[model samples]
Target chain A: APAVGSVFLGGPFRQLVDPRTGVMSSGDQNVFSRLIEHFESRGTTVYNAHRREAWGAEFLSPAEATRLDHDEIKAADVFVAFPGVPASPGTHVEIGWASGMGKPMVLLLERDEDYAFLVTGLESQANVEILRFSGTEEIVERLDGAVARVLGR
Target chain B: AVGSVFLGGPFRQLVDPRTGVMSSGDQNVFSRLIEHFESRGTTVYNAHRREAWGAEFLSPAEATRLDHDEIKAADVFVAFPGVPASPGTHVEIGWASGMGKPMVLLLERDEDYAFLVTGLESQANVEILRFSGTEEIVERLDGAVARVLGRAGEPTV
Candidate 1:
Protein backbone atom coordinates (compact mmCIF):
# COMPACT_ATOMS: atom_id res chain seq x y z
CA ALA A 1 0.00 0.00 0.00
CA PRO A 2 1.26 3.52 -0.76
CA ALA A 3 1.89 5.45 2.43
CA VAL A 4 -0.36 8.41 3.22
CA GLY A 5 1.60 11.20 4.95
CA SER A 6 0.84 13.82 7.61
CA VAL A 7 2.90 16.98 7.05
CA PHE A 8 3.67 19.78 9.55
CA LEU A 9 4.68 23.16 8.24
CA GLY A 10 7.08 24.57 10.78
CA GLY A 11 6.77 27.78 8.91
CA PRO A 12 8.89 30.96 8.58
CA PHE A 13 7.06 32.72 5.78
CA ARG A 14 3.52 33.20 7.07
CA GLN A 15 4.36 33.51 10.74
CA LEU A 16 6.96 36.15 11.58
CA VAL A 17 9.03 37.18 14.59
CA ASP A 18 9.42 40.74 15.85
CA PRO A 19 13.13 41.27 15.41
CA ARG A 20 13.40 43.66 18.33
CA THR A 21 11.19 41.74 20.76
CA GLY A 22 11.59 38.15 19.51
CA VAL A 23 7.87 37.67 19.91
CA MET A 24 5.81 35.77 17.32
CA SER A 25 3.10 37.48 15.28
CA SER A 26 1.00 36.45 12.31
CA GLY A 27 2.10 37.85 8.98
CA ASP A 28 0.34 38.20 5.62
CA GLN A 29 -0.66 35.15 3.50
CA ASN A 30 2.83 34.96 1.94
CA VAL A 31 2.71 31.15 1.68
CA PHE A 32 4.46 28.57 -0.45
CA SER A 33 1.44 27.32 -2.43
CA ARG A 34 3.48 25.09 -4.72
CA LEU A 35 4.67 22.91 -1.89
CA ILE A 36 1.20 22.74 -0.39
CA GLU A 37 -0.18 21.70 -3.76
CA HIS A 38 2.59 19.13 -4.22
CA PHE A 39 1.76 17.39 -0.94
CA GLU A 40 -2.02 17.65 -1.29
CA SER A 41 -1.87 16.16 -4.77
CA ARG A 42 -0.05 13.15 -3.34
CA GLY A 43 -2.69 12.32 -0.68
CA THR A 44 -0.84 14.02 2.18
CA THR A 45 -2.63 16.32 4.63
CA VAL A 46 -0.76 19.60 5.00
CA TYR A 47 -1.10 21.79 8.10
CA ASN A 48 0.09 25.34 7.47
CA ALA A 49 -0.03 27.28 10.74
CA HIS A 50 -1.13 30.60 9.25
CA ARG A 51 -3.60 29.29 6.69
CA ARG A 52 -5.43 27.27 9.34
CA GLU A 53 -6.54 30.25 11.37
CA ALA A 54 -8.96 33.23 11.45
CA TRP A 55 -6.89 36.22 12.45
CA GLY A 56 -6.55 39.80 13.82
CA ALA A 57 -7.94 39.56 17.30
CA GLU A 58 -6.67 38.95 20.79
CA PHE A 59 -9.14 36.08 20.43
CA LEU A 60 -6.42 34.39 18.40
CA SER A 61 -4.36 34.10 21.54
CA PRO A 62 -0.85 32.76 21.60
CA ALA A 63 -2.03 29.93 23.80
CA GLU A 64 -4.52 28.71 21.22
CA ALA A 65 -2.12 29.10 18.33
CA THR A 66 0.80 27.41 20.06
CA ARG A 67 -1.17 24.51 21.45
CA LEU A 68 -2.75 23.73 18.09
CA ASP A 69 0.53 24.17 16.22
CA HIS A 70 2.30 21.76 18.54
CA ASP A 71 -0.49 19.23 18.47
CA GLU A 72 -0.27 19.14 14.68
CA ILE A 73 3.51 18.78 14.76
CA LYS A 74 3.22 15.88 17.16
CA ALA A 75 0.67 14.21 14.91
CA ALA A 76 2.78 14.77 11.81
CA ASP A 77 4.77 12.09 10.00
CA VAL A 78 7.14 14.59 8.44
CA PHE A 79 8.19 18.09 9.63
CA VAL A 80 8.93 20.67 6.94
CA ALA A 81 10.76 23.94 7.72
CA PHE A 82 10.08 26.88 5.35
CA PRO A 83 12.74 29.39 6.36
CA GLY A 84 13.23 32.33 4.04
CA VAL A 85 13.87 36.10 4.14
CA PRO A 86 13.17 37.96 7.43
CA ALA A 87 13.54 35.16 9.95
CA SER A 88 10.77 33.81 12.15
CA PRO A 89 11.29 33.00 15.83
CA GLY A 90 8.19 30.82 16.07
CA THR A 91 9.40 28.80 13.12
CA HIS A 92 12.62 28.12 14.98
CA VAL A 93 10.56 27.06 17.96
CA GLU A 94 8.67 24.73 15.66
CA ILE A 95 11.93 23.50 14.23
CA GLY A 96 13.21 22.74 17.70
CA TRP A 97 10.06 20.81 18.48
CA ALA A 98 10.18 18.75 15.29
CA SER A 99 13.89 18.13 15.62
CA GLY A 100 13.76 16.96 19.22
CA MET A 101 10.69 14.83 18.57
CA GLY A 102 12.86 12.82 16.16
CA LYS A 103 10.50 13.41 13.24
CA PRO A 104 11.92 12.88 9.77
CA MET A 105 12.33 16.47 8.50
CA VAL A 106 13.19 18.64 5.53
CA LEU A 107 14.83 22.02 6.18
CA LEU A 108 13.97 24.13 3.11
CA LEU A 109 16.06 27.25 2.71
CA GLU A 110 15.90 30.06 0.18
CA ARG A 111 19.25 30.50 -1.56
CA ASP A 112 19.42 34.10 -0.36
CA GLU A 113 19.09 33.30 3.31
CA ASP A 114 22.25 33.04 5.38
CA TYR A 115 20.65 31.80 8.57
CA ALA A 116 22.68 31.19 11.68
CA PHE A 117 23.89 27.68 12.43
CA LEU A 118 21.18 27.30 15.05
CA VAL A 119 18.79 27.03 12.07
CA THR A 120 21.07 25.73 9.30
CA GLY A 121 23.03 23.49 11.64
CA LEU A 122 19.98 21.28 12.09
CA GLU A 123 21.00 19.42 8.93
CA SER A 124 23.49 17.38 10.99
CA GLN A 125 20.75 15.46 12.78
CA ALA A 126 19.83 12.01 11.51
CA ASN A 127 16.78 11.57 9.21
CA VAL A 128 16.95 15.29 8.32
CA GLU A 129 17.33 16.36 4.68
CA ILE A 130 18.53 19.91 3.90
CA LEU A 131 16.92 21.23 0.70
CA ARG A 132 18.06 24.60 -0.61
CA PHE A 133 16.85 26.28 -3.79
CA SER A 134 16.83 29.52 -5.80
CA GLY A 135 13.45 29.17 -7.51
CA THR A 136 10.80 27.17 -9.43
CA GLU A 137 12.11 23.90 -10.85
CA GLU A 138 15.00 23.55 -8.41
CA ILE A 139 12.64 23.81 -5.46
CA VAL A 140 10.16 21.35 -6.92
CA GLU A 141 12.86 18.78 -7.59
CA ARG A 142 14.38 19.00 -4.12
CA LEU A 143 11.00 19.21 -2.42
CA ASP A 144 9.78 16.04 -4.12
CA GLY A 145 13.05 14.25 -3.53
CA ALA A 146 13.21 15.24 0.15
CA VAL A 147 9.60 14.28 0.81
CA ALA A 148 10.16 10.86 -0.70
CA ARG A 149 13.38 10.42 1.27
CA VAL A 150 11.46 11.04 4.49
CA LEU A 151 8.27 9.14 3.61
CA GLY A 152 10.43 6.52 1.94
CA ARG A 153 12.08 5.76 5.27
CA ALA B 1 18.93 5.31 35.96
CA VAL B 2 19.31 8.63 37.84
CA GLY B 3 17.06 11.35 36.43
CA SER B 4 18.88 13.42 33.83
CA VAL B 5 18.02 17.17 33.61
CA PHE B 6 18.97 19.68 30.90
CA LEU B 7 19.42 23.44 31.66
CA GLY B 8 19.21 26.23 29.06
CA GLY B 9 18.98 30.03 28.91
CA PRO B 10 20.84 33.15 27.70
CA PHE B 11 24.45 32.00 27.89
CA ARG B 12 26.58 33.18 24.97
CA GLN B 13 25.77 36.86 25.49
CA LEU B 14 26.79 36.67 29.10
CA VAL B 15 30.42 35.76 28.30
CA ASP B 16 32.62 38.52 29.71
CA PRO B 17 34.95 39.92 27.07
CA ARG B 18 37.82 40.62 29.45
CA THR B 19 37.98 37.15 30.94
CA GLY B 20 36.71 35.04 28.03
CA VAL B 21 34.47 33.30 30.58
CA MET B 22 30.96 34.05 31.72
CA SER B 23 30.51 37.21 33.77
CA SER B 24 31.00 36.71 37.49
CA GLY B 25 27.28 37.16 38.06
CA ASP B 26 26.23 34.38 35.67
CA GLN B 27 29.21 32.19 36.58
CA ASN B 28 28.25 32.06 40.22
CA VAL B 29 24.54 31.71 39.53
CA PHE B 30 24.92 29.04 36.86
CA SER B 31 27.52 27.06 38.81
CA ARG B 32 25.29 27.05 41.82
CA LEU B 33 22.39 26.21 39.55
CA ILE B 34 24.24 23.09 38.38
CA GLU B 35 24.98 22.17 41.98
CA HIS B 36 21.31 22.58 42.82
CA PHE B 37 20.44 19.64 40.55
CA GLU B 38 23.61 17.62 41.04
CA SER B 39 23.39 17.84 44.81
CA ARG B 40 19.92 16.36 44.54
CA GLY B 41 21.45 13.12 43.23
CA THR B 42 19.94 13.77 39.75
CA THR B 43 22.26 13.71 36.73
CA VAL B 44 22.35 17.17 35.14
CA TYR B 45 23.53 18.49 31.76
CA ASN B 46 23.83 22.26 32.22
CA ALA B 47 24.35 23.70 28.71
CA HIS B 48 26.77 26.38 29.87
CA ARG B 49 29.25 23.83 31.20
CA ARG B 50 29.62 22.28 27.76
CA GLU B 51 30.02 25.60 25.87
CA ALA B 52 33.17 26.01 23.73
CA TRP B 53 34.93 29.28 24.67
CA GLY B 54 36.48 31.15 21.72
CA ALA B 55 35.39 31.97 18.11
CA GLU B 56 31.99 32.04 16.36
CA PHE B 57 30.46 29.33 14.13
CA LEU B 58 32.79 26.65 15.53
CA SER B 59 31.52 27.26 19.02
CA PRO B 60 27.79 27.33 18.14
CA ALA B 61 28.13 24.23 15.93
CA GLU B 62 29.36 22.20 18.86
CA ALA B 63 27.13 24.00 21.36
CA THR B 64 23.99 23.49 19.28
CA ARG B 65 24.82 19.82 18.62
CA LEU B 66 25.57 19.05 22.25
CA ASP B 67 22.48 20.86 23.52
CA HIS B 68 20.29 18.82 21.17
CA ASP B 69 21.75 15.49 22.29
CA GLU B 70 21.63 16.45 25.94
CA ILE B 71 18.01 17.61 25.67
CA LYS B 72 17.24 14.29 23.99
CA ALA B 73 18.92 12.40 26.82
CA ALA B 74 17.30 14.23 29.72
CA ASP B 75 14.10 13.60 31.66
CA VAL B 76 13.40 17.28 32.44
CA PHE B 77 14.28 20.66 30.97
CA VAL B 78 14.86 23.88 32.98
CA ALA B 79 15.32 27.44 31.74
CA PHE B 80 16.42 30.62 33.52
CA PRO B 81 15.38 33.11 30.86
CA GLY B 82 16.51 35.92 33.17
CA VAL B 83 15.40 39.39 32.09
CA PRO B 84 13.65 39.82 28.71
CA ALA B 85 13.48 36.02 28.30
CA SER B 86 16.33 34.97 26.07
CA PRO B 87 15.50 33.75 22.59
CA GLY B 88 17.64 30.64 22.89
CA THR B 89 15.67 29.54 25.92
CA HIS B 90 12.51 29.48 23.78
CA VAL B 91 14.19 27.10 21.36
CA GLU B 92 15.14 24.84 24.24
CA ILE B 93 11.64 24.99 25.70
CA GLY B 94 10.13 24.06 22.34
CA TRP B 95 12.58 21.22 21.99
CA ALA B 96 11.89 19.82 25.43
CA SER B 97 8.14 20.13 25.02
CA GLY B 98 8.25 18.12 21.81
CA MET B 99 10.35 15.41 23.45
CA GLY B 100 7.73 15.09 26.23
CA LYS B 101 10.28 16.11 28.85
CA PRO B 102 8.89 18.02 31.83
CA MET B 103 10.02 21.66 32.17
CA VAL B 104 10.71 24.25 34.93
CA LEU B 105 11.11 27.90 33.90
CA LEU B 106 12.81 30.28 36.35
CA LEU B 107 11.89 33.86 35.58
CA GLU B 108 12.37 37.32 37.11
CA ARG B 109 9.40 38.24 39.26
CA ASP B 110 9.05 41.76 37.93
CA GLU B 111 9.50 41.06 34.23
CA ASP B 112 7.01 39.74 31.74
CA TYR B 113 7.73 36.47 29.95
CA ALA B 114 7.06 36.95 26.27
CA PHE B 115 3.86 35.29 25.04
CA LEU B 116 5.66 32.16 23.89
CA VAL B 117 6.84 31.55 27.43
CA THR B 118 3.62 32.68 28.99
CA GLY B 119 1.56 30.44 26.71
CA LEU B 120 3.17 27.19 27.87
CA GLU B 121 1.14 27.37 31.08
CA SER B 122 -1.62 25.40 29.39
CA GLN B 123 0.67 22.53 28.48
CA ALA B 124 1.17 19.45 30.62
CA ASN B 125 4.30 18.90 32.71
CA VAL B 126 5.24 22.58 32.72
CA GLU B 127 6.04 24.75 35.79
CA ILE B 128 7.01 28.41 36.09
CA LEU B 129 8.86 29.93 39.06
CA ARG B 130 9.22 33.67 39.55
CA PHE B 131 11.91 35.10 41.78
CA SER B 132 12.81 38.54 43.12
CA GLY B 133 16.57 38.11 43.33
CA THR B 134 19.31 35.81 42.09
CA GLU B 135 19.68 34.20 45.50
CA GLU B 136 15.95 33.70 45.83
CA ILE B 137 15.76 31.87 42.52
CA VAL B 138 18.67 29.63 43.45
CA GLU B 139 17.00 28.57 46.65
CA ARG B 140 13.37 28.60 45.45
CA LEU B 141 14.15 26.17 42.64
CA ASP B 142 14.43 23.26 45.05
CA GLY B 143 10.69 22.54 45.11
CA ALA B 144 10.40 22.52 41.33
CA VAL B 145 13.27 20.05 41.08
CA ALA B 146 11.69 17.96 43.82
CA ARG B 147 8.44 17.62 41.90
CA VAL B 148 10.19 16.64 38.68
CA LEU B 149 12.30 14.02 40.47
CA GLY B 150 9.45 12.66 42.54
CA ARG B 151 7.36 12.26 39.41
CA ALA B 152 10.24 10.43 37.78
CA GLY B 153 10.19 7.95 40.69
CA GLU B 154 13.51 9.21 42.01
CA PRO B 155 13.87 10.15 45.68
CA THR B 156 14.75 13.80 46.16
CA VAL B 157 17.17 15.18 48.72
Candidate 2:
Protein backbone atom coordinates (compact mmCIF):
# COMPACT_ATOMS: atom_id res chain seq x y z
CA ALA A 1 0.00 0.00 0.00
CA PRO A 2 2.83 2.34 0.86
CA ALA A 3 4.08 1.69 -2.65
CA VAL A 4 1.09 3.71 -3.71
CA GLY A 5 3.34 6.67 -2.95
CA SER A 6 1.80 9.87 -1.62
CA VAL A 7 -1.77 10.96 -2.20
CA PHE A 8 -1.75 14.65 -3.08
CA LEU A 9 -4.73 16.40 -1.53
CA GLY A 10 -5.58 19.28 -3.85
CA GLY A 11 -8.31 21.84 -3.09
CA PRO A 12 -8.68 25.46 -2.00
CA PHE A 13 -7.68 26.26 1.59
CA ARG A 14 -5.28 29.16 1.24
CA GLN A 15 -7.64 31.99 0.35
CA LEU A 16 -10.23 30.89 2.92
CA VAL A 17 -9.37 33.42 5.59
CA ASP A 18 -12.19 34.35 7.97
CA PRO A 19 -13.26 37.98 7.93
CA ARG A 20 -15.83 38.05 10.73
CA THR A 21 -14.62 35.00 12.61
CA GLY A 22 -10.94 36.12 12.65
CA VAL A 23 -9.31 32.67 12.67
CA MET A 24 -10.76 29.29 11.92
CA SER A 25 -13.99 28.42 13.74
CA SER A 26 -14.63 25.35 15.86
CA GLY A 27 -16.56 23.55 13.15
CA ASP A 28 -13.67 24.01 10.73
CA GLN A 29 -11.25 22.64 13.29
CA ASN A 30 -13.38 19.60 13.84
CA VAL A 31 -13.68 18.88 10.14
CA PHE A 32 -9.97 19.36 9.55
CA SER A 33 -8.87 17.06 12.36
CA ARG A 34 -11.39 14.42 11.53
CA LEU A 35 -10.37 14.37 7.87
CA ILE A 36 -6.71 13.97 8.78
CA GLU A 37 -7.44 11.24 11.28
CA HIS A 38 -9.48 9.38 8.73
CA PHE A 39 -6.59 9.29 6.29
CA GLU A 40 -4.01 8.34 8.90
CA SER A 41 -6.13 5.49 10.14
CA ARG A 42 -6.11 4.01 6.70
CA GLY A 43 -2.28 4.11 6.55
CA THR A 44 -2.25 6.69 3.81
CA THR A 45 -0.03 9.73 3.54
CA VAL A 46 -2.11 12.80 2.85
CA TYR A 47 -0.08 15.58 1.19
CA ASN A 48 -2.37 18.53 1.69
CA ALA A 49 -1.85 21.40 -0.76
CA HIS A 50 -2.43 24.06 1.87
CA ARG A 51 0.20 22.59 4.16
CA ARG A 52 2.80 22.22 1.46
CA GLU A 53 5.87 24.25 2.43
CA ALA A 54 6.57 25.01 -1.20
CA TRP A 55 3.11 26.47 -1.85
CA GLY A 56 3.07 29.80 -0.03
CA ALA A 57 4.38 32.97 -1.65
CA GLU A 58 7.54 32.84 0.42
CA PHE A 59 8.49 29.29 -0.57
CA LEU A 60 8.31 29.53 -4.34
CA SER A 61 9.15 32.20 -6.84
CA PRO A 62 7.18 31.98 -10.10
CA ALA A 63 9.79 29.69 -11.61
CA GLU A 64 10.18 27.85 -8.33
CA ALA A 65 6.44 27.33 -7.99
CA THR A 66 6.26 25.68 -11.39
CA ARG A 67 9.15 23.39 -10.61
CA LEU A 68 7.85 22.55 -7.16
CA ASP A 69 4.38 21.76 -8.42
CA HIS A 70 5.88 19.44 -10.99
CA ASP A 71 8.06 17.90 -8.31
CA GLU A 72 5.04 17.22 -6.09
CA ILE A 73 3.32 15.40 -8.90
CA LYS A 74 6.39 13.28 -9.38
CA ALA A 75 6.23 12.39 -5.71
CA ALA A 76 2.65 11.17 -5.81
CA ASP A 77 1.06 8.14 -7.43
CA VAL A 78 -2.49 9.39 -6.92
CA PHE A 79 -4.07 12.84 -6.95
CA VAL A 80 -7.28 13.33 -4.94
CA ALA A 81 -8.98 16.65 -5.59
CA PHE A 82 -11.25 17.98 -2.88
CA PRO A 83 -14.21 20.18 -3.66
CA GLY A 84 -13.79 23.79 -2.82
CA VAL A 85 -15.68 26.83 -4.09
CA PRO A 86 -13.51 28.49 -6.74
CA ALA A 87 -11.43 25.52 -7.87
CA SER A 88 -8.04 27.30 -8.05
CA PRO A 89 -5.71 27.34 -11.03
CA GLY A 90 -3.10 25.41 -9.07
CA THR A 91 -5.49 22.56 -8.41
CA HIS A 92 -6.60 22.48 -12.01
CA VAL A 93 -3.00 22.43 -13.16
CA GLU A 94 -2.25 19.54 -10.88
CA ILE A 95 -5.20 17.67 -12.32
CA GLY A 96 -4.11 18.25 -15.90
CA TRP A 97 -0.53 17.37 -15.15
CA ALA A 98 -1.52 14.25 -13.33
CA SER A 99 -3.73 13.28 -16.19
CA GLY A 100 -0.88 13.82 -18.62
CA MET A 101 1.43 11.77 -16.42
CA GLY A 102 -1.16 9.02 -16.35
CA LYS A 103 -1.60 9.06 -12.58
CA PRO A 104 -4.92 8.09 -11.04
CA MET A 105 -7.23 10.96 -10.15
CA VAL A 106 -10.09 10.85 -7.65
CA LEU A 107 -12.33 13.65 -6.51
CA LEU A 108 -14.30 13.89 -3.26
CA LEU A 109 -17.17 16.30 -3.68
CA GLU A 110 -19.12 17.68 -0.75
CA ARG A 111 -22.79 16.94 -0.48
CA ASP A 112 -23.61 20.60 -1.05
CA GLU A 113 -25.86 20.68 -4.09
CA ASP A 114 -24.24 23.70 -5.73
CA TYR A 115 -20.87 22.03 -5.81
CA ALA A 116 -22.41 19.00 -7.43
CA PHE A 117 -23.45 21.08 -10.44
CA LEU A 118 -20.06 22.71 -10.81
CA VAL A 119 -18.14 19.47 -10.42
CA THR A 120 -20.37 17.61 -12.82
CA GLY A 121 -19.82 20.37 -15.35
CA LEU A 122 -16.12 20.74 -14.67
CA GLU A 123 -15.36 17.04 -14.73
CA SER A 124 -17.61 16.24 -17.66
CA GLN A 125 -14.69 15.21 -19.85
CA ALA A 126 -11.88 14.19 -17.55
CA ASN A 127 -11.04 10.52 -17.13
CA VAL A 128 -11.03 10.97 -13.36
CA GLU A 129 -13.91 9.85 -11.17
CA ILE A 130 -15.83 12.03 -8.75
CA LEU A 131 -17.02 10.44 -5.49
CA ARG A 132 -19.73 12.52 -3.86
CA PHE A 133 -20.19 12.07 -0.12
CA SER A 134 -21.86 13.61 2.94
CA GLY A 135 -19.72 13.35 6.08
CA THR A 136 -16.23 12.43 7.30
CA GLU A 137 -17.26 8.87 8.06
CA GLU A 138 -18.35 8.31 4.49
CA ILE A 139 -15.30 10.15 3.11
CA VAL A 140 -13.04 7.66 4.86
CA GLU A 141 -14.85 4.78 3.27
CA ARG A 142 -14.73 6.33 -0.18
CA LEU A 143 -11.01 7.00 0.14
CA ASP A 144 -10.41 3.38 1.04
CA GLY A 145 -12.23 2.29 -2.06
CA ALA A 146 -10.41 4.78 -4.33
CA VAL A 147 -7.05 3.54 -3.06
CA ALA A 148 -8.02 -0.06 -3.64
CA ARG A 149 -9.20 0.70 -7.12
CA VAL A 150 -6.02 2.59 -7.96
CA LEU A 151 -3.70 0.18 -6.22
CA GLY A 152 -5.58 -2.90 -7.36
CA ARG A 153 -6.39 -3.93 -3.80
CA ALA B 1 -25.04 2.52 -9.61
CA VAL B 2 -28.68 2.67 -10.76
CA GLY B 3 -29.25 6.31 -9.91
CA SER B 4 -25.68 7.43 -10.35
CA VAL B 5 -25.41 10.15 -12.97
CA PHE B 6 -22.35 10.93 -15.09
CA LEU B 7 -21.92 14.08 -17.16
CA GLY B 8 -19.43 14.93 -19.95
CA GLY B 9 -18.69 18.34 -21.54
CA PRO B 10 -15.91 20.09 -23.44
CA PHE B 11 -15.65 22.95 -20.88
CA ARG B 12 -14.58 25.42 -23.58
CA GLN B 13 -17.04 25.12 -26.45
CA LEU B 14 -18.98 28.34 -26.00
CA VAL B 15 -15.90 30.52 -26.57
CA ASP B 16 -16.44 30.20 -30.27
CA PRO B 17 -19.48 32.45 -29.81
CA ARG B 18 -17.74 35.65 -28.75
CA THR B 19 -14.05 36.05 -29.60
CA GLY B 20 -13.43 33.40 -32.17
CA VAL B 21 -15.23 32.74 -35.43
CA MET B 22 -17.89 30.77 -33.54
CA SER B 23 -21.13 32.17 -34.92
CA SER B 24 -24.32 32.90 -33.02
CA GLY B 25 -25.74 30.10 -35.12
CA ASP B 26 -23.13 27.74 -33.72
CA GLN B 27 -23.85 28.82 -30.19
CA ASN B 28 -27.58 28.45 -30.66
CA VAL B 29 -27.14 25.11 -32.29
CA PHE B 30 -25.10 23.83 -29.38
CA SER B 31 -27.41 25.40 -26.84
CA ARG B 32 -30.45 23.88 -28.49
CA LEU B 33 -28.93 20.45 -28.10
CA ILE B 34 -28.53 21.18 -24.39
CA GLU B 35 -32.13 22.37 -24.31
CA HIS B 36 -33.21 19.07 -25.79
CA PHE B 37 -31.47 17.21 -22.97
CA GLU B 38 -33.11 19.42 -20.38
CA SER B 39 -36.50 18.54 -21.81
CA ARG B 40 -35.57 14.90 -21.33
CA GLY B 41 -34.50 15.40 -17.67
CA THR B 42 -30.87 14.58 -18.31
CA THR B 43 -28.25 16.71 -16.57
CA VAL B 44 -26.46 18.94 -19.06
CA TYR B 45 -22.66 18.75 -19.05
CA ASN B 46 -20.73 21.95 -19.82
CA ALA B 47 -17.36 22.73 -18.23
CA HIS B 48 -15.60 25.91 -19.40
CA ARG B 49 -12.47 25.66 -17.35
CA ARG B 50 -10.58 23.46 -19.75
CA GLU B 51 -9.96 24.11 -23.48
CA ALA B 52 -11.11 22.27 -26.62
CA TRP B 53 -10.95 18.65 -25.71
CA GLY B 54 -8.63 20.48 -23.37
CA ALA B 55 -6.33 20.82 -26.34
CA GLU B 56 -6.07 24.53 -27.24
CA PHE B 57 -7.87 25.55 -24.00
CA LEU B 58 -10.21 28.44 -23.23
CA SER B 59 -9.22 32.03 -22.79
CA PRO B 60 -9.85 33.73 -19.45
CA ALA B 61 -12.89 35.58 -20.77
CA GLU B 62 -14.30 32.41 -22.33
CA ALA B 63 -13.71 30.46 -19.15
CA THR B 64 -15.60 33.08 -17.17
CA ARG B 65 -18.61 33.03 -19.49
CA LEU B 66 -18.75 29.26 -19.67
CA ASP B 67 -18.57 29.09 -15.89
CA HIS B 68 -21.63 31.29 -15.69
CA ASP B 69 -23.54 29.01 -18.02
CA GLU B 70 -22.34 25.85 -16.30
CA ILE B 71 -23.38 27.15 -12.88
CA LYS B 72 -26.79 28.15 -14.17
CA ALA B 73 -27.49 24.79 -15.80
CA ALA B 74 -26.20 22.38 -13.16
CA ASP B 75 -28.24 20.94 -10.29
CA VAL B 76 -25.26 19.94 -8.17
CA PHE B 77 -21.75 21.39 -8.27
CA VAL B 78 -18.96 18.87 -7.85
CA ALA B 79 -15.96 21.16 -7.32
CA PHE B 80 -12.41 19.88 -7.53
CA PRO B 81 -9.37 21.92 -6.50
CA GLY B 82 -5.85 20.92 -7.41
CA VAL B 83 -4.76 23.09 -4.54
CA PRO B 84 -6.25 23.58 -1.08
CA ALA B 85 -9.52 25.49 -0.71
CA SER B 86 -8.39 29.04 -1.00
CA PRO B 87 -9.38 30.95 -4.08
CA GLY B 88 -10.45 28.42 -6.71
CA THR B 89 -12.80 26.10 -4.86
CA HIS B 90 -14.23 28.90 -2.76
CA VAL B 91 -14.92 31.03 -5.82
CA GLU B 92 -16.53 28.15 -7.70
CA ILE B 93 -18.85 27.38 -4.76
CA GLY B 94 -19.90 30.99 -4.39
CA TRP B 95 -20.80 31.22 -8.04
CA ALA B 96 -22.55 27.87 -8.11
CA SER B 97 -24.64 28.55 -5.01
CA GLY B 98 -25.43 32.13 -5.93
CA MET B 99 -27.20 30.73 -8.95
CA GLY B 100 -29.22 28.43 -6.65
CA LYS B 101 -27.26 25.27 -7.40
CA PRO B 102 -26.72 22.57 -4.74
CA MET B 103 -23.20 21.81 -3.50
CA VAL B 104 -21.05 18.76 -2.83
CA LEU B 105 -17.56 19.46 -1.44
CA LEU B 106 -14.28 17.58 -1.66
CA LEU B 107 -11.01 18.62 0.02
CA GLU B 108 -7.85 16.71 -0.82
CA ARG B 109 -5.41 18.75 1.21
CA ASP B 110 -2.39 17.06 2.71
CA GLU B 111 -2.67 15.34 6.08
CA ASP B 112 -0.64 18.21 7.51
CA TYR B 113 -2.83 20.86 5.90
CA ALA B 114 -5.22 22.93 7.98
CA PHE B 115 -8.86 23.02 6.88
CA LEU B 116 -10.18 25.17 9.74
CA VAL B 117 -9.89 28.22 7.54
CA THR B 118 -11.58 26.61 4.57
CA GLY B 119 -14.30 24.56 6.27
CA LEU B 120 -15.73 27.12 8.69
CA GLU B 121 -16.79 29.99 6.46
CA SER B 122 -18.65 27.78 4.00
CA GLN B 123 -22.43 28.14 3.98
CA ALA B 124 -23.63 26.03 6.86
CA ASN B 125 -25.81 24.45 4.21
CA VAL B 126 -22.84 23.25 2.19
CA GLU B 127 -21.53 19.69 2.57
CA ILE B 128 -17.74 19.21 2.75
CA LEU B 129 -15.66 16.04 2.52
CA ARG B 130 -12.04 15.22 3.17
CA PHE B 131 -10.96 12.74 0.53
CA SER B 132 -10.12 9.55 2.35
CA GLY B 133 -11.45 7.10 -0.24
CA THR B 134 -14.26 6.48 -2.70
CA GLU B 135 -16.45 4.42 -0.39
CA GLU B 136 -16.86 7.34 1.98
CA ILE B 137 -17.81 9.62 -0.89
CA VAL B 138 -20.41 7.17 -2.20
CA GLU B 139 -21.96 6.88 1.23
CA ARG B 140 -22.07 10.63 1.58
CA LEU B 141 -23.70 11.06 -1.81
CA ASP B 142 -26.37 8.52 -0.94
CA GLY B 143 -27.18 10.22 2.35
CA ALA B 144 -27.06 13.75 0.95
CA VAL B 145 -29.32 13.02 -1.99
CA ALA B 146 -31.70 11.10 0.24
CA ARG B 147 -31.80 13.94 2.72
CA VAL B 148 -32.25 16.55 0.03
CA LEU B 149 -34.98 14.63 -1.78
CA GLY B 150 -36.58 13.74 1.49
CA ARG B 151 -36.67 17.33 2.61
CA ALA B 152 -38.17 18.24 -0.73
CA GLY B 153 -40.93 15.70 -0.01
CA GLU B 154 -40.12 13.82 -3.18
CA PRO B 155 -41.72 10.42 -3.53
CA THR B 156 -40.37 7.47 -5.47
CA VAL B 157 -42.69 6.22 -8.20
Whole-model lDDT values for every prediction: 0.67, 0.49
TM-score of 1: 0.74
Which candidate's DockQ is highest?
1
Off by over 4 Å in 2: A1-3, A19-26, A29-33, A53-63, A112-127, B1-157
Q: What local lDDT does model 1 show for residue B50?
A: 61
Model 1: how far residue B101 lies from native, Å: 2.2
Stretches of model 1 off by over 4 angstroms after superposition: A1-4, A12-28, A32-35, A41-43, A55-59, A83-87, A110-118, A133-141, B1-4, B12-22, B38-43, B52-65, B72-75, B81-88, B109-116, B152-157
| lDDT by residue for model 1 (B83-109), tens | 643545666777776656667888888
Tens digits of lDDT, candidate 2, B32-128: 5345445556565544313333345454445544655555555555544323233334335444433334445555535432232233223323455
All candidates: DockQ: 0.29, 0.03
Lowest lDDT block of 10, candidate 1 chain B: B52-61
